[PDB]
């Protein structure tokens, strides 16, 4: 009837359906050949009995506490970054030890990654090096000197990339738009003549320009069969001659695929002309490179990737491998995009065994405690806000011009 | 997971139409001792098959 979170269970109320809904977690938390009651004559049996639930009696009963608590991840206040360009904000973000470096290192440590730290300290998240690599950043423990341990030279690597911005609607501005390397396409001029006694607005001149590309591929197969007969006869005047007859047949099959993409652009002018007058018009089209600056305020999200090998003594992956494999996983720190990359979705769905496909958070709660994981995940998912300035540029764009001239009396 | 409002009526409907063994091994009545599991995008409800019958 009600969802049961395994971290709230207590062997002092528990329905048979509730016990069956969360079965593997309850079986794993009891000793082998242990028998404890549930409710209304039902009891649950431990390992060695294959977790069978059968009618019985017992004085030791599982019992969900009268008033359990909600285990949601808390929401913290936003972190403010000093204003600058996109790269300055990223640099300021990835160099904060107390707000960024420690929580992510602790998250990597809690999930079972190995050697999250440098050689000059004994604690997680200490002696970490930050480097700029391509469009992202890499954080890894310092590897200078020596270390003592099995594969202590294989430090876990944390990578940050794909930064996105959620703008405040009323903060965006942009400056002057400038053009360079202009090339003419086509122009048109014309006149609109009105010789009636009333104003007229039924005029139209339109210029359009299109470009396109296409591709295709084809495969063909076939067969052929032929029979030939040859003989020789003597015919009058022709004398000896050779006569040959051939009959053939063939079959063929073909298959094709393709595609295309078209780009278009048009300009129109529709002037209103006074009575007994005329008006000139002109339309131009160009190709040019465009540039302009901008500024805004937004919220910053990014992708978080953890790379390393999982500890032999225990890790949080749902299959619990024990051969120290190399692992990669990506989280999206921000709005929901997918189930495999959402921490909140996996955390909220931990009461359904069939939804546990990537990480086992109940194992982490057992290992470290509920409040520790709650605070760590709250610090990890803290919102970030900053002011941004930047520059836009693009090559081979379109530029147009439409003009309506002054009227000339007739 | 509602036994009185979902599990019982559907089990009785399956029983009335002629389906066999709508129930678990730990009870003698239709719609008792049923297991609920999450499978893909849907759910499966079937009688418990532990022990003997």
From Swiss-Prot, chain A:
Proteolytic cleavage and subsequent release of the propeptide trigger a major conformation change, leading to the formation of a heptameric pre-pore that then inserts into the host membrane. The keyword Disulfide bond applies. The record marks 339, 355 as: Important for heptamerization. One of its GO terms (molecular function) is toxin activity. One of its GO terms (cellular component) is extracellular region. Gene3D superfamilies: Aerolysin/Pertussis toxin (APT), N-terminal domain, Proaerolysin, chain A, domain 2, Proaerolysin, chain A, domain 3. The record marks 120 as: Important for oligomerization. It holds the Pfam family Aerolysin. GO terms for biological process: symbiont-mediated cytolysis of host cell. Residues 221-253 are annotated as: Part of the transmembrane beta-barrel after proteolytic activation of the toxin and insertion into the host membrane. It is found in: Secreted; Host cell membrane. Keywords: Disulfide bond, Host cell membrane, Host membrane, Membrane, Secreted, Signal, Toxin, Transmembrane, Transmembrane beta strand, Virulence. Residues 33-49 are annotated as: Interaction with host N-linked glycan. Homodimer in solution; homoheptamer in the host membrane. After binding to GPI-anchored proteins in target membranes and proteolytic removal of the C-terminal propeptide, the protein assembles into a heptameric pre-pore complex. A further conformation change leads to insertion into the host membrane. Secreted, cytolytic toxin that forms pores in host membranes after proteolytic removal of a C-terminal propeptide, leading to destruction of the membrane permeability barrier and host cell death. The pores are formed by transmembrane beta-strands and are approximately 3 nm in diameter. Belongs to the aerolysin family. This is Aerolysin. The gene is aerA.
Curated annotation (Swiss-Prot), chain B:
The record marks 26 as: Important for oligomerization. It is found in: Secreted; Host cell membrane. It comes from the Bacteria. Coiled coil: none annotated. Proteolytic cleavage and subsequent release of the propeptide trigger a major conformation change, leading to the formation of a heptameric pre-pore that then inserts into the host membrane. Secreted, cytolytic toxin that forms pores in host membranes after proteolytic removal of a C-terminal propeptide, leading to destruction of the membrane permeability barrier and host cell death. The pores are formed by transmembrane beta-strands and are approximately 3 nm in diameter. Homodimer in solution; homoheptamer in the host membrane. After binding to GPI-anchored proteins in target membranes and proteolytic removal of the C-terminal propeptide, the protein assembles into a heptameric pre-pore complex. A further conformation change leads to insertion into the host membrane. Belongs to the aerolysin family. The C-terminal propeptide is required for normal protein folding and secretion; it maintains the aerolysin precursor in its soluble form and prevents premature heptamerization and pore formation. This is Aerolysin. It comes from Aeromonas hydrophila. The chain holds residues 130 to 182 of 493 of the full protein.
């Amino acid at each position: 009837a009600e969802p049961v979170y395994p971290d709230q269970l207590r062997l002092f109320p528990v329905n048979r359906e509730e016990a069956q809904s969360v079965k593997s977690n309850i079986v794993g938390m009891m000793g082998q050949w242990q028998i404890s009651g549930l409710a209304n004559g039902w009891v649950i049996m431990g390992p060695g009995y294959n977790g069978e639930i059968k009618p019985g009696t017992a004085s030791n009963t599982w019992c969900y506490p009268t008033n359990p608590v909600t285990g949601e991840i808390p929401t913290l206040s936003a972190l403010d970054i000093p204003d600058g360009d996109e790269v300055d904000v990223q640099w300021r973000l990835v160099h904060d030890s107390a707000n960024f470096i420690k929580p992510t290192s602790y998250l990597a440590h809690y999930l079972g990654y190995a050697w999250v730290g440098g050689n000059h300290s004994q604690y997680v998240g200490e002696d970490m090096d930050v480097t700029r690599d391509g469009d992202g950043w890499v954080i890894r423990g310092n590897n200078d000197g020596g270390c003592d341990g099995y594969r202590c030279g294989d430090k876990t690597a944390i990578k940050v990339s794909n930064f996105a911005y959620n703008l405040d609607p009323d903060s965006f501005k942009h400056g002057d738009v400038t053009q360079s390397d202009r090339q003419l396409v086509k122009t048109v001029v014309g006149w609109a003549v009105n010789d009636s006694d009333t104003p007229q607005s039924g005029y139209d001149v339109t210029l359009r320009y299109d470009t396109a590309t296409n591709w295709s591929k084809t495969n063909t197969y076939g067969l052929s069969e032929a029979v030939t007969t040859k003989n020789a006869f003597k015919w009058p005047l022709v004398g000896e001659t050779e006569l040959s007859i051939e009959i053939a047949a063939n079959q063929s099959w073909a298959s094709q695929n393709g595609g295309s993409t078209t780009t278009s652009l048009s300009q129109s002018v529709r002037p209103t002309v006074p009575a007994r007058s005329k008006i000139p018009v002109k339309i131009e089209l160009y190709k040019a490179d465009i540039s302009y600056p901008y500024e805004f305020k937004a919220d910053v999200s990014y992708d978080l990737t953890l790379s390393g090998f999982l500890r032999w003594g225990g890790n949080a992956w749902y299959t619990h491998p024990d051969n120290r494999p190399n692992w990669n996983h990506t989280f999206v720190i921000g709005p929901y995009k997918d189930k495999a990359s959402s921490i909140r979705y996996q955390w909220d769905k931990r009461y359904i065994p069939g939804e546990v496909k990537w990480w086992d958070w109940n194992w982490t709660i057992q290992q470290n405690g509920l409040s520790t994981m709650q605070n760590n995940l709250a610090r990890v998912l803290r919102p970030v806000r900053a002011g941004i300035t930047g520059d836009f540029s693009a090559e081979s764009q379109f530029a147009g011009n439409i003009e309506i001239g002054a009227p000339v009396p007739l």
